[PDB]
Amino acid sequence: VSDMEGTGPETGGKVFDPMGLSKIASAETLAWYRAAELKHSRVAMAAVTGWAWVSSGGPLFPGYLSVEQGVTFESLGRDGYAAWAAVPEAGKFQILGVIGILEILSESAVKPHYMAGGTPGKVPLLWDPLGFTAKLSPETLARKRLAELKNGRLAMIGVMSLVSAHFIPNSVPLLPGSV
Amino acid sequence: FADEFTFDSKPWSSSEIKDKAGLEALAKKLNPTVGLWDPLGIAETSPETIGWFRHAEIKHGRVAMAAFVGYCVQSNGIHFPWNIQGWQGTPVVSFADIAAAGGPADQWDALSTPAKLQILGVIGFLEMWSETSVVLKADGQEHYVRGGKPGYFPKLSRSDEMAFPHPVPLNLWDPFGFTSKMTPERKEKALLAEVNNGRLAMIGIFGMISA
Amino acid sequence: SAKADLEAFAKECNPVVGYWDPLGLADLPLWGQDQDAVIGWLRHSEIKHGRIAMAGFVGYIAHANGFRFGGIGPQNVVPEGASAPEVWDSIPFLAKLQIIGAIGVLEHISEDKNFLAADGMKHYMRGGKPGYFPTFSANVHPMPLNLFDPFKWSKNASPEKKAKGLVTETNNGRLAMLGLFGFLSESKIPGSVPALSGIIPSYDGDYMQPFLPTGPDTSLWTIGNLWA
Amino acid sequence: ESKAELESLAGKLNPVIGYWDPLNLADYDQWSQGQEAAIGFLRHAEIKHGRVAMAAFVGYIVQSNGICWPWALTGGPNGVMHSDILAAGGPADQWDALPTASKLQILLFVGGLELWSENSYVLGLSGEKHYMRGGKPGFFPSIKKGGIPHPVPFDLFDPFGLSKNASPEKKAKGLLAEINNGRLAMLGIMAFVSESKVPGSVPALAGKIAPYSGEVMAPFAASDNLPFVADMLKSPLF
Ligand SMILES: CC(=O)O[C@H]1CC(C)(C)C(=C=C/C(C)=C/C=C/C(C)=C/C=C/C=C(C)/C=C/C=C(\C)C(=O)C[C@@]23O[C@]2(C)C[C@@H](O)CC3(C)C)[C@](C)(O)C1
Ligand SMILES: CC(=O)O[C@H]1CC(C)(C)C(=C=C/C(C)=C/C=C/C(C)=C/C=C/C=C(C)/C=C/C=C(\C)C(=O)C[C@@]23O[C@]2(C)C[C@@H](O)CC3(C)C)[C@](C)(O)C1
Ligand code: KC2
Ligand code: KC2
Ligand code: KC2
Ligand code: KC2
Numbered sequence: 001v002s003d004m005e006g007t008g009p010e011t012g013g014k015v016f017d018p019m020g021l022s023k024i025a026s027a028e029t030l031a032w033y034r035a036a037e038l039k040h041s042r043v044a045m046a047a048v049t050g051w052a053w054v055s056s057g058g059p060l061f062p063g064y065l066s067v068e069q070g071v072t073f074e075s076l077g078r079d080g081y082a083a084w085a086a087v088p089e090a091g092k093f094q095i096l097g098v099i100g101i102l103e104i105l106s107e108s109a110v111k112p113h114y115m116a117g118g119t120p121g122k123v124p125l126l127w128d129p130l131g132f133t134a135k136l137s138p139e140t141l142a143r144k145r146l147a148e149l150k151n152g153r154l155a156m157i158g159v160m161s162l163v164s165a166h167f168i169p170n171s172v173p174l175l176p177g178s179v
Numbered sequence: 180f181a182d183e184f185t186f187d188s189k190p191w192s193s194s195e196i197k198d199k200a201g202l203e204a205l206a207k208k209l210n211p212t213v214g215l216w217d218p219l220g221i222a223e224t225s226p227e228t229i230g231w232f233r234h235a236e237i238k239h240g241r242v243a244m245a246a247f248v249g250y251c252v253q254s255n256g257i258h259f260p261w262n263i264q265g266w267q268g269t270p271v272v273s274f275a276d277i278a279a280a281g282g283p284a285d286q287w288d289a290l291s292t293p294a295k296l297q298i299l300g301v302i303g304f305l306e307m308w309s310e311t312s313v314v315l316k317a318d319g320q321e322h323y324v325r326g327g328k329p330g331y332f333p334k335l336s337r338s339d340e341m342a343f344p345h346p347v348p349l350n351l352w353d354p355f356g357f358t359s360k361m362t363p364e365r366k367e368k369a370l371l372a373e374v375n376n377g378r379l380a381m382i383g384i385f386g387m388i389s390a
Numbered sequence: 391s392a393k394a395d396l397e398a399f400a401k402e403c404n405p406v407v408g409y410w411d412p413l414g415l416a417d418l419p420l421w422g423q424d425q426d427a428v429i430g431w432l433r434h435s436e437i438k439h440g441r442i443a444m445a446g447f448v449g450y451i452a453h454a455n456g457f458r459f460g461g462i463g464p465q466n467v468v469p470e471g472a473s474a475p476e477v478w479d480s481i482p483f484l485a486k487l488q489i490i491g492a493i494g495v496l497e498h499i500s501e502d503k504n505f506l507a508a509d510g511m512k513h514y515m516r517g518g519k520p521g522y523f524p525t526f527s528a529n530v531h532p533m534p535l536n537l538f539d540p541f542k543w544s545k546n547a548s549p550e551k552k553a554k555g556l557v558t559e560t561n562n563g564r565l566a567m568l569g570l571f572g573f574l575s576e577s578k579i580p581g582s583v584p585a586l587s588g589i590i591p592s593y594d595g596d597y598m599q600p601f602l603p604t605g606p607d608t609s610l611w612t613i614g615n616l617w618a
Numbered sequence: 619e620s621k622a623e624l625e626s627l628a629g630k631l632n633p634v635i636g637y638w639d640p641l642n643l644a645d646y647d648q649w650s651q652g653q654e655a656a657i658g659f660l661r662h663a664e665i666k667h668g669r670v671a672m673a674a675f676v677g678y679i680v681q682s683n684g685i686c687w688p689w690a691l692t693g694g695p696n697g698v699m700h701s702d703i704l705a706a707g708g709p710a711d712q713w714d715a716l717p718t719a720s721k722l723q724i725l726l727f728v729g730g731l732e733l734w735s736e737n738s739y740v741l742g743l744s745g746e747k748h749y750m751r752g753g754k755p756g757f758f759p760s761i762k763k764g765g766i767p768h769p770v771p772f773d774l775f776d777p778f779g780l781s782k783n784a785s786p787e788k789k790a791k792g793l794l795a796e797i798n799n800g801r802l803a804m805l806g807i808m809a810f811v812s813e814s815k816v817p818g819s820v821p822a823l824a825g826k827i828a829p830y831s832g833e834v835m836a837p838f839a840a841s842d843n844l845p846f847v848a849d850m851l852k853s854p855l856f
């Protein structure tokens with residue numbers, strides 16, 4: 001676990017694992033832990049960015065969401081949970097199904113599997129279609145992967161702060177009681 | 180300075196009293212009759228504590244004799260003929276008004292607050308100039324706790340590197356050489372006297388305050 | 391042997407009494423660890439209790455007699471004339487939380503391998519000095535002053551003087567413990583400390599519950615109080 | 619510099635004290651670039667605070683005594699006279715009563731000077747380096763030699779060349795005097811402002827410094843209609 005990346009000056013160069021969950025982790029278990037961390041971090045980054053954009057006041061999507069059934073992007077409202085409640089069940093099922101197809105493609109298509117001796121967090125299609133991170137050297141690429149991990153860990157705490165503010169009202173400061 | 184702020188002891192290198200025998204010698208020199216009268220046994224202490232007690236006694240002697248003479252003068256009512264305030268567009272107060280305020284404690288009370296602060300500030304400046312080890316070592320002595328003579332006030336007039344930015348005219352003790360040259364041990368006789376009349380003036384000033 | 395060191399330390403603390411262990415806690419196997427580790431734990435616990443009790447005594451005189459900082463802060467919700475048990479009860483809940491949390495962070499830094507190793511020391515049960523708070527030389531953000539001797543007044547002090555200082559620390563901490571719980575006991579069993587009869591007022595409320603009463607829920611921040 | 623040289627300079631500033639760092643801020647490694655870099659930053663901070671504080675002390679004395687300029691500050695048929703800025707109140711109130719453009723351009727001119735000092739290319743072109751990299755701790759480079767497109771008449775330090783051909787000993791003595799005068803002038807200016815805000819805080823000055831209501835450490839007052847200024851000033855503080 002000491003040679004698995006994610007350590008930084010924030011821990012002090014050492015692994016942050018007080019409960020000792022790394023001691024009972026093999027190579028496969030550690031790979032699973034890193035894969036889950038990478039996935040959760042990416043999901044939380046996207047979730048925080050979306051929720052902040054929607055609730056803050058940014059210019060949301062123009063036009064209709066459903067011409068028939070009369071649901072509009074403006075009409076959905078800026079509360080995140082209310083928006084996800086008011087979006088059509090067809091749209092929710094579609095988002096979830098596409099995410100599921102992508103998850104199963106990440107599991108199967110990447111033949112050297114992250115559990116069976118592979119790189120955790122290597123979803124092949126869903127990364128850099130325009131080739132931006134193509135000429136970066138290994139050193140800066142490792143720096144940016146550590147950036148991904150750190151930013152996403154912060155994003156996970158952010159989205160949990162958001163849902164805590166929505167569920168347990170007046171829980172987190174710097175989040176108005178409604179959400 | 181941070182290297183000398185030790186909170187601890189360093190070896191002594193002088194003939195200053197650092198034991199009960201040395202205290203007893205000075206005790207008989209002060210008064211052959213009483214000798215050493217130490218019921219609390221504060222002679223059974225370290226050299227630094229012995230020097231601290233010696234300097235504390237001397238300083239109480241200074242302040243007590245000055246206080247007794249000042250008390251006597253202020254009770255006599257020999258006030259100053261000046262005005263004590265009212266030149267930078269402030270109210271006018273006179274030393275006659277301070278005298279008519281009441282007894283000397285009442286006179287100090289009637290003294291204005293910034294006047295009190297300035298007097299105490301001068302006295303504090305004198306105190307820390309005394310305590311400055313670097314000044315004494317530019318001069319010929321050390322801190323009384325670390326083997327220096329208890330009671331020495333360093334010269335306020337000097338031309339050394341450790342001299343004030345503006346020249347100071349005179350020193351605190353012996354400004355015009357009224358001591359000039361006492362004999363090399365008549366100074367010590369006068370020190371013995373100083374301790375004795377210091378104790379007497381101590382008793383006198385506290386008795387007057389009590390009365 | 392750690393026991394031999396402890397007996398010598400007790401003789402230094404008081405040669406009349408010497409080693410006084412009527413329960414054999416130094417021989418108790420706490421957590422199944424050996425006698426050296428257990429004695430390390432007991433010495434750390436004694437020093438920690440004594441330290442906190444000395445601070446508690448001085449703070450009892452500070453709060454009960456009336457000694458407050460000025461300005462916007464927790465001091466502005468405590469009623470004037472409040473007694474030492476009402477001061478903690480009257481500060482905001484966030485003040486209680488953050489005080490205990492900062493004390494917790496200091497405990498964590500005290501027992502963390504990182505700081506103790508950066509200072510070239512080990513844990514007090516693993517062959518270390520019982521009662522040693524490490525410098526913040528391994529904290530992520532460079533930290534201005536350390537906890538012990540922040541101005542480094544003891545940068546050059548003799549080891550003998552340091553040993554005597556630790557002997558003083560233990561004894562004064564024990565005595566401060568006795569005095570502080572004298573103050574506490576006089577308020578919940580009157581006539582228990584005869585000298586304090588009439589001085590310490592009675593207090594109805596559990597001392598050992600930190601968060602009871604919860605205290606006010608005020609928001610004392612002024613510039614940028616967006617969280618309110 | 620190093621701690622040894624800092625101690626020597628402290629001895630030259632006051633031989634009685636010598637080094638006086640009760641916090642050991644020289645050993646406090648901040649910015650994580652070594653004790654030399656940290657001491658350089660602290661020395662520059664001392665020198666720059668001193669320079670600004672002595673300048674502000676003279677400015678406070680001049681403005682608080684009704685010595686406004688004869689010419690106007692704003693231009694137009696209705697322009698805020700410097701006399702009106704004077705009549706706004708005490709000096710802090712004068713600053714708060716300045717036009718927003720005046721405030722912005724003053725602080726941005728100072729900022730231009732600051733970044734000009736901080737740039738290492740211009741420092742190297744004028745000689746010496748950044749103060750955290752071995753250069754002279756407080757040293758404003760030459761706005762001329764930097765190579766600005768139009769030829770400026772004068773540099774910021776010594777525009778007329780009066781300290782030119784100064785003895786190196788006089789230069790060191792002058793830097794010692796700069797640090798000490800700045801050290802005292804910081805207390806002077808903060809004492810003026812503290813008397814303005816809290817009456818009686820500085821007992822000597824009693825009734826001689828005008829009062830002031832708004833926060834002094836707030837360059838933009840309510841008159842400044844800029845993003846977030848009114849929202850910032852909504853909640854006051856001691
Ligand atoms: C006092 C208190 O309680 O405060 C409250 C309030 C507060 C602070 C608000 C709270 C919160 C929430 C927080 C702070 C949440 C943080 C969330 C976070 C940190 C979210 C990151 C998203 C990152 C994304 C989407 C990046 C995409 C980035 C992309 C697509 C890339 O990297 C692409 C690319 O770069 C590469 C890789 C290569 C380069 O060649 C360039 C390109 C562009 C090609 C809390 C927790 O509630 C606490
Ligand atoms: C939360 C909140 O809002 O709190 C409120 C409440 C609270 C905290 C109570 C408040 C307050 C009051 C405060 C903080 C007051 C602070 C007062 C302060 C800081 C007072 C210093 C005086 C120093 C003097 C006179 C030094 C002279 C020193 C001298 C003569 C020298 O400079 C000498 C020298 O150095 C030179 C020039 C250089 C060398 O050649 C030689 C030496 C070294 C010898 C506030 C502001 O209301 C805020
Ligand atoms: C208002 C305060 C005050 C009073 C009322 C007072 C009264 C008397 C009397 C009483 C009739 C005598 C007989 C006497 C004698 C001596 N005083 Mg003394 N004195 C006062 C103040 C100071 C100060 C500040 C110093 C000082 C000293 C000496 C020395 C040492 C000379 C030397 O050997 O250099 C001698 C002999 C200096 C010293 O070193 O004292 C250890 C020193 O600094 N005195 N002093
Ligand atoms: C509120 C808390 C508190 C109080 C009231 C208090 C009182 C006293 C008294 C007064 C009766 C004495 C005489 C004394 C003496 C020493 N204290 Mg102590 N102390 C407190 C806190 C800490 C902390 C945090 C540390 C510490 C230490 C030492 C060392 C060791 C020096 C060395 O060996 O370098 C010595 C000699 C450091 C250490 O290492 O202790 C093993 C250390 O980290 N103390 N301490
Ligand atoms: C030794 C203990 C201690 C430490 C080490 C420490 C550290 C930090 C850090 C770390 C970097 C941050 C970021 C931070 C932030 C805030 N602290 Mg805090 N703090 C400590 C103690 C207290 C007390 C006693 C109070 C307090 C408060 C607040 C408020 C909210 C103000 C408000 O909501 O009005 C904010 C934003 C006050 C409060 O909550 O008042 C209701 C309050 O009374 N803190 N505090
Ligand atoms: C800090 C120093 C400083 C510098 C280095 C500097 C340089 C330049 C340059 C060259 C680079 C030009 C070209 C220029 C032009 C104008 N300056 Mg300006 N200026 C500075 C300071 C002030 C202050 C305090 C004020 C001010 C103003 C104006 C007005 C409008 C007057 C009006 O309103 O009729 C005009 C046209 C006044 C104002 O109202 O600005 C909106 C005003 O109060 N300036 N200024």
Ligand code: KC2
Nearest residue numbers: 669670672673754756757758775788789792793795796799
């Ligand atoms: C508010 C602004 C300000 C004030 C009020 C002020 C006052 C005093 C005083 C009065 C108490 C003295 C006695 C003094 C003396 C010297 N100042 Mg100085 N000064 C200010 C600003 C600057 C700047 C920006 C620089 C500077 C410098 C020098 C040098 C050059 C030495 C050399 O050539 O080696 C010497 C001798 C330049 C330098 O290089 O300093 C290392 C430099 O860049 N000063 N300065």
Ligand SMILES: CC1=C(C#C/C(C)=C/C=C/C(C)=C/C=C/C=C(C)/C=C/C=C(C)/C=C/[C@@]23O[C@]2(C)C[C@@H](O)CC3(C)C)C(C)(C)C[C@H](O)C1
Nearest residue numbers: 266267268269297301335336347348349350351352353354
């Ligand atoms: C109000 C105002 C104005 C003003 C003003 C000004 C300039 C006011 C100035 C006031 C001033 C300059 C006040 C000094 C007091 C000094 C004292 C008390 C010294 C005692 C000193 C003593 C007791 C010294 C004793 C010794 O030294 C002796 C004798 C010999 C040495 O061997 C030993 C010692 C050291 C012990 C203007 C300019 C008119 C207009 C403006 O608009 C507003």
